From Swiss-Prot:
Keywords recorded for this protein, A-Z: Adaptive immunity, Chromosomal rearrangement, Cytokine, Disulfide bond, Glycoprotein, Growth factor, Immunity, Pharmaceutical, Proto-oncogene, Secreted, Signal
Major subcellular location class: secreted
Name by which UniProt lists this protein: Interleukin-2
Transmembrane segments: none
Shown chain mapped onto the complete sequence: 25 to 153 of 153
Localization (cell): Secreted
Lineage: Eukaryota, Metazoa, Chordata, Craniata, Vertebrata
Disease linked to the protein: A chromosomal aberration involving IL2 is found in a form of T-cell acute lymphoblastic leukemia (T-ALL). Translocation t(4;16)(q26;p13) with involves TNFRSF17.
GO cellular component, one term: extracellular space
Cystines in this chain: 54-88
């Protein structure tokens, strides 16, 4: 019931990020070009729960980029705090919101695989 809960917490996180990615790729979004000009930071390594601190630190720019077009941001925040309860090392190369979301979706799938 503890491992399952953790798994469910990650599943919601995964889905939340996907919903953001979907709303950005919707042809109804009139600000995709502007959104892509935003710069996001990515962790050098992303293989451990504690690395979610790196995601948490970016929720602000995340909210701002989406606001260009939240109930989801807050949901992510809650999950993240539940998973990691660490000093992040970020890569030099910044990423677009699309790359940023992909990377974390991939991180979620990885961790979910591990604890199943
Ligand atoms: S590389 C910045 C390109 C110029 N555009 C912006 O600054 C726009 C308005 N906002 C963003 O790109 C959002 N990203 C951030 O706020 C960045 N911080 C984090 N990702 N944590 C900072 C942008 C400004 C330079 C330092 C990073």
């Amino acid at each position: 019931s503890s491992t399952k809960k953790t798994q469910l917490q990650l599943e919601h996180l995964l889905l939340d990020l996907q919903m953001i990615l979907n709303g950005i790729n919707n042809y109804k979004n009139p600000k995709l070009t502007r959104m892509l000009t935003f710069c996001f930071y990515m962790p050098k390594k992303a293989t451990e729960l504690k690395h979610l601190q790196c995601l948490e630190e970016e929720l602000k720019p995340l909210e701002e980029v989406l606001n260009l077009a939240r109930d989801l941001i807050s949901n992510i925040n809650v999950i993240v705090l539940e998973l990691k309860g660490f000093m992040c090392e970020y890569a030099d190369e910044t990423a677009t919101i699309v790359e940023f979301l992909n990377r974390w979706i991939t991180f979620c799938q990885s961790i979910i695989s591990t604890l199943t």
